[PDB]
Amino acid sequence: YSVLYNLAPFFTFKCYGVSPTKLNDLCFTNVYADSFVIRGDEVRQIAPG
């Protein structure tokens, strides 16, 4: 996760249940990625509940 600041940072980057601040030393069973495109106003809609 260290090599991610090659793309314009300033990116809404919110982690639920974990802190991304230099905490990449956690082993996960299987990691899933879902990517798509939304509008700026509906960014806040992407959150649990």
Partner: protein, 49 residues
Amino acid sequence: NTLVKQLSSKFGAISSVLNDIFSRLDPPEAEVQIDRLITGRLQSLQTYV
């Protein structure tokens, strides 16, 4: 036996293991989680006494 078994209660925290909490999250939430855990365990100890 009840005192021993009370150690496996989350008490509203993410997990019942202090090391996982410290190695998974950033301090500002870690203090409140471990504070909840410590308060629960202290209450159990006082009841046993």
